[PDB]
Design a protein around this ligand. Structure first.
Ligand SMILES: [Zn+2]
Ligand SMILES: [Zn+2]
Length: 56
DNA sequence: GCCAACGTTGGC
DNA sequence: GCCAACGTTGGC
């Protein structure tokens, strides 16, 4: 694997899923269909996440 | 065995 | 070159 948490940015410090972004809504637990399978947009690490996963 | 989400690629 | 889509995998 590649480490995807720097651990010290506002995204990594965030506690809970936002429950409103495209990735959250897609989670089965939020009622989505699991077609995207990514972590909350607002929990995507600002240093280590692929840039396409950051908020837009 | 489940499952969050990583990591690869077919199709553009 | 890009990413939507989903197969995979580490942690539990
Ligand atoms: Zn979210
Ligand atoms: Zn971070």
């Amino acid at each position: 694997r590649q480490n995807r948490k720097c651990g010290a940015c506002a995204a990594c410090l965030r506690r809970m899923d936002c429950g409103r972004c495209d990735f959250c809504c897609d989670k089965p637990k939020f009622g989505g269909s699991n077609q995207k399978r990514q972590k909350c947009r607002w929990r995507q690490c600002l240093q280590f996440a692929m840039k396409r996963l950051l908020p837009s």
